[PDB]
Paper text:
The plasma membrane of fungal and plant cells contains a proton-pumping P-type adenosine triphosphatase (ATPase) that maintains the intracellular pH and generates a proton-motive force, driving the import of nutrients by secondary transporters. We have determined the structure of hexameric Pma1 from Neurospora crassa by electron cryo-microscopy at 3.3-Å resolution, elucidating the molecular basis for hexamer formation and autoinhibition and providing a basis for structure-based drug development.
An atomic model was built into the monomer map and then extended into a hexameric model by symmetry-assisted placement of five additional copies into the hexamer map. We added 600 μM AlFx to the sample before grid preparation, with the aim to stabilize the enzyme in its transition state of phosphorylation, E1~P. However, we did not find a clear density for AlFx in its expected position between the adenosine diphosphate (ADP) β-phosphate and the Asp378 carboxyl group. The M1 helix with its characteristic 90° kink (induced by Pro123) is embedded deeply inside the membrane, forming a wide funnel-shaped access toward the H+ binding site in M6, similar to the Ca2+ entry funnel in SERCA (and see more detailed discussion below). The mouth of this access pathway is negatively charged because of the conserved Glu162 in M2, and it extends into a large aqueous cavity between M1, M2, M6, and an unwound region in M4 around the conserved Pro335. Asp730 is situated adjacent to the internal cavity and opposite the equally highly conserved Asn154 in M2, at a distance suitable for capturing a proton within a hydrogen bond (2.9 Å between the aspartate carboxyl and the asparagine amide).
Residue numbers in the entry: 66 to 268, 284 to 880, 892 to 920
């Protein structure tokens, strides 16, 4: 739909009836199709078909058949308890989904790509979707194009970053009148857009683990049901008793709300993270951040502050006595609303008497090449009152000399002093900037170096120290030379193994064997003189060795690296494209925020893992107890008691998402074989405890075994199962022994209340025909505590360079060699 779907001259050319700057009277627009068309607003706030949706399903059908086959509404004892359990599961699921969907949207709101349109006044900006179609737009150097459309008549070329919706990853340089694609970035440019198709033709991992776990649990429940049905067939049980058995085992076996409570834990953790100034794009980024082993962070803005200190410019040069300040400030963009960190320090340190007032007047800029990362060099051409074209150049100290090597070519008197001074200021931890000037058509003097300095953030050193205890390995990425990077590493205690990116082999190699360039990249404390492509190459290499890499991105240059990284982190002050391509967007600066978010994500993952182990352990426990007891002895717990056991497993679990869970000291990952081993062993231990409990009463009579004065088997088993099952959470939510960390008051209270309810059940026996002695419950508590201790001890006991053989090194060498020979041949002699 182009012409008949909301597009013609009056939303196209009537846009361009005013000047560039101005817009008035969004009049009667007749249609606001802007808010992610029919995606979030699709069937708005139904809020009642989610409730009934939880009442329909495989297990819910089994429960409905159970509640119907209880002689209908004859008596409110079996029907009442079964419908109560079904209602409780439905309500808990609905509340959890509501909480998880009402808090992931609050993170979406605080991260929407706000869009700027300039009207008569200095209009701030327009919130993303509520912008009228057929309206002007200002896409400015790394902003996600809010609305699809075409360019405005003004002449300028913007390099739109594509391959998000198209194929080519290179410069897709639409110039004038072409189709500008929405939800795409702009690498560089300054153009205006006319809106067309404002919402038309816009062309995790824990969930899969949960799905697999649920499938295996279903398999286990089916196996148990098969045992029960076979053993009932051999005994010719009436169909009603078989149905009661299968209902009990269906209730205990399949966890109704495992993925729901896992998503609730993720959502609560994401909300807590966003409270800590760390907004998560996709809910799956929590696990990815918890799993990262290497954090490749840019030095500027993360490991150090963006404000620079200037210390005595090196004005020791030839004829040029003081021109450093004047010519360097000549190359200032002076916008004061889009200038970078480098530009500010020149203006703040312009306390120069002779000509600093007269140097900013009449020096009209003709050409201003922006700072190119591949060149590390800003070049400006301006006018002067003398009439000359002073082409200022400013960049890395060596690159300025590489620029001035043509005229006045490398005199030994000045070049040696220049290199010695830049090395000296590297030793002093000073960022240096060189400047060269062009008076005439054949003059090229070298002015000198400018010793800027940006100190590390006051919390950076201890943050890096603690990051080594967390299992991370921080790899700094500097565009600076090797000397400055190495001195910064010495200052930060980051270790001094800094390799120049181009020399090492990131990209076009230097005939370094491929098996060892990967080894150097893996064991490297940093990378100096890094270009945008080297970031992606570093991420690609580090993942081959088997790591999970977290990249600190900022700006549109490192968007592909952010996408390729397992956890792309958009640091403070990033552009719209950088945070759109990242996984976690930060609203606080420094590495301290990143490390705090890492610790929080590890805590959230610990909560998730502890709950999963809890759920499947008690599932295995209670299924291999009840199924075995039915098979061997044609007996099972009273249906009301087993329903209440299931309920108690949905009360002590709506609190796991809110507790003081500790964080692992090493990167944490889904070790599914170890998870299943631990859970099967815990369930087997619990089942052995329960079987001991019941075989005591077989051995010494109904009221003579684990019970002392009087009791009944069913309520005693109820109490033992409830205690040993709910107390299992205290050992899964710990690092080592269960007494290491103190559980939160909420979890402890919710579990102690359930324990009190189970004890009252046993003492007064209000679902069976007899009560239990007050000393029998004491003995059951003692035995359950012993089982808890042995189970926790089992859980605690089992809780705990070239990275390649000949095959791996050969493979990496072959990969790098084939890349190099492809380049070599492609050169075609
Ligand atoms: N705006 C600028 N004008 C001139 N030189 C610059 C500018 N920004 C950075 N440089 C120089 O380029 C080199 C590193 O630039 P960069 O790659 O930007 O460091 P970072 O990537 O850590 O911001 C250093 O020599 C620095 O002084
Ligand atoms: K990613
Ligand atoms: Mg940087």
């Amino acid at each position: 739909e182009a012409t008949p779907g909301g597009g013609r001259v009056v939303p196209e050319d009537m846009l361009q009836t005013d000047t560039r700057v101005g817009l008035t009277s969004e009049e009667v627009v007749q249609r606001r199709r802007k808010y992610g068309l029919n995606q979030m607003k699709e069937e708005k706030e139904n809020h009642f078909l989610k409730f009934l949706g939880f009442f329909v399903g495989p297990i819910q059908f089994v429960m409905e058949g159970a509640a119907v086959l209880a002689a209908g509404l004859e008596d409110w004892v079996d029907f009442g308890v079964i419908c109560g359990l079904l209602l409780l599961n439905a309500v808990v699921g609905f509340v959890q989904e509501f909480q998880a969907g009402s808090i992931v949207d609050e993170l979406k709101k605080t991260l929407a790509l706000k869009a700027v349109v300039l009207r008569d006044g200095t209009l701030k900006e327009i919130e993303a979707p509520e912008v009228v179609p057929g309206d002007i737009l200002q896409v400015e150097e790394g902003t996600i194009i809010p609305a699809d459309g075409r360019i405005v008549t003004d002449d300028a070329f913007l390099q739109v970053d594509q391959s998000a919706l198209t194929g080519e990853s290179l410069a897709v340089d639409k110039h004038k009148g072409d189709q500008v694609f929405a939800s795409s970035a702009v690498k560089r440019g300054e153009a205006f857009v006319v809106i067309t198709a404002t919402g038309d033709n816009t062309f995790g991992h824990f969930t899969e683990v949960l799905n697999g776990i649920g499938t295996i649990l279903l398999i286990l429940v089916i196996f148990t049901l098969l045992i029960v049905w076979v053993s009932s067939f051999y005994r010719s049980n009436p169909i009603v008793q078989i149905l009661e058995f299968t209902l009990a085992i269906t209730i205990i076996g399949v966890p109704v709300g495992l993925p729901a409570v896992v998503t609730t834990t993720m959502a609560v953790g994401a909300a807590y993270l966003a409270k800590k100034k760390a907004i998560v794009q996709k809910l799956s980024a929590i696990e990815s951040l918890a799993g990262v082993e290497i954090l490749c962070s840019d030095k500027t803005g993360t490991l150090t502050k963006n404000k620079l200190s200037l210390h005595d410019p090196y004005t020791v040069a030839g004829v040029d006595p003081e021109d450093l300040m004047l010519t360097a400030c000549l190359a200032a963009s002076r916008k004061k609303k889009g200038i970078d960190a480098i530009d500010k320090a020149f203006l703040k340190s312009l306390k120069y008497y002779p000509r600093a007032k007269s140097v900013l007047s009449k020096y009209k800029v003709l050409q201003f090449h922006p700072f190119d990362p591949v060149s590390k060099k800003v070049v400006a051409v301006v006018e002067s009152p003398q009439g000359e074209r002073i082409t200022c150049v400013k960049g890395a100290p060596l690159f300025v000399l590489k620029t001035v090597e043509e005229d006045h070519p490398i005199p030994e008197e000045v070049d040696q002093a220049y290199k010695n001074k830049v090395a000296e200021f590297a030793t002093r931890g000073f960022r240096s900037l060189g400047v060269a000037r062009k008076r005439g058509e054949g003059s090229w003097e070298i002015l000198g170096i400018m010793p800027c300095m940006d100190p590390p953030r006051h919390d950076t050193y201890k943050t890096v120290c603690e990051a080594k205890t967390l299992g991370l390995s921080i790899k700094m990425l500097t565009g600076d030379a090797v000397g400055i990077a190495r001195e910064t590493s010495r200052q930060l205690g980051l270790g001094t193994n800094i390799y120049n990116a181009e020399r090492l082999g990131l990209g076009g190699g230097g005939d370094m064997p491929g098996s060892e360039v990967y080894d150097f990249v893996e064991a490297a404390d940093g990378f100096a003189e890094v270009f945008p492509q080297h970031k992606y190459n570093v991420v690609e290499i580090l993942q081959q060795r088997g790591y999970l890499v977290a990249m600190t991105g900022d700006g549109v240059n490192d968007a592909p690296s952010l996408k390729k990284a397992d956890t792309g982190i958009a640091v403070e002050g990033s552009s719209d494209a950088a945070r759109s391509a990242a996984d976690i967007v930060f609203l606080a600066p420094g590495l301290g925020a990143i490390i705090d978010a890492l610790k929080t994500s590890r805590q959230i993952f610990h909560r998730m893992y502890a709950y999963v182990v809890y759920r499947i352990a008690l599932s295995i426990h209670l299924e291999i107890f009840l199924g075995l007891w039915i098979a061997i002895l044609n007996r099972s717990l009273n249906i009301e008691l087993v329903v209440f056991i299931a309920i108690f497993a949905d009360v002590a679990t709506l609190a796991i998402a809110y507790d003081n869970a500790p964080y692992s000291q090493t990167p944490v990952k889904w070790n599914l074989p170890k998870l299943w081993g631990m859970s099967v062993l815990l369930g087997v231990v619990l089942a052995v405890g329960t079987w001991i409990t019941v075989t005591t009463m077989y051995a010494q009579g109904e009221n003579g075994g684990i019970v002392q004065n009087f009791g009944n088997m069913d309520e005693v088993l109820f109490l033992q199962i409830s205690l040993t099952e709910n107390w299992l959470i205290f050992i899964t939510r710990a690092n080592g022994p269960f007494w290491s960390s103190i559980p939160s008051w909420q979890l402890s209270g919710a579990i102690f209340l359930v324990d009190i309810l189970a004890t009252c059940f046993t003492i007064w026996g209000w679902f069976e025909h007899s009560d239990t002695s007050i000393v029998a419950v004491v003995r059951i508590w003692i035995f359950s505590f012993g089982i808890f201790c042995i189970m926790g001890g089992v859980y605690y006991i089992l809780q705990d360079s070239p990275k390649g053989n000949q095959k791996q090194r050969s493979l990496e060498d072959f990969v790098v060699s084939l890349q190099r020979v492809s380049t070599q041949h492609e050169k075609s002699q």
